Amino acid sequence: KVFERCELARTLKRLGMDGYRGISLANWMCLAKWESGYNTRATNYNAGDRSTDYGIFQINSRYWCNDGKTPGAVNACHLSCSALLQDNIADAVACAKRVVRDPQGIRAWVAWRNRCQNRDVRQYVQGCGV
Numbered sequence: 001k002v003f004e005r006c007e008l009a010r011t012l013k014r015l016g017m018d019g020y021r022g023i024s025l026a027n028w029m030c031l032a033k034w035e036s037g038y039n040t041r042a043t044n045y046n047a048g049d050r051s052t053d054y055g056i057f058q059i060n061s062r063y064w065c066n067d068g069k070t071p072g073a074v075n076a077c078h079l080s081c082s083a084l085l086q087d088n089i090a091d092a093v094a095c096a097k098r099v100v101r102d103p104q105g106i107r108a109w110v111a112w113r114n115r116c117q118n119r120d121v122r123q124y125v126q127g128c129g130v
């Protein structure tokens, strides 16, 4: 499912992401936008390290979810990567919250660093009513 901007904003708010570890909803929206384009079925395989990034948050199969074909996987979210390809993003959110609880925080998302950090992101939630 490719969410609409404000639709996703309201969904993330309902799922407790606004202000989580101090991260605003606008920041979460910015990384979802640049990591997946708001598409829950987005999948990106890294041929070099043999791991895949799944879903709207592009979560890695080597550290957070288990897809069975990733060498040296850890599965810290205790989730089947397939759970991150569903239309209901509840599991994706619970896992995204786990990821930020790691020392690096939101710096785990490459796209946030390149396109959202130290930048005005208020545009992502304008007119959504969140």
Ligand SMILES: *[C@@H]1O[C@H](CO)[C@@H](O[C@@H]2O[C@H](CO)[C@H](O)[C@H](O)[C@H]2O)[C@H](O)[C@H]1NC(C)=O
Binding pocket: 057, 058, 059, 060, 063, 064, 076, 099, 102, 103, 104, 108, 109
């Ligand atoms: C993207 O890949 C990163 C590795 O290059 C990964 O970062 C590592 O995550 C580890 C989790 O146990 C630990 O925090 C390492 O210190 C860190 O380098 C990052 O989590 C991945 N991002 C996503 C969204 O999956």
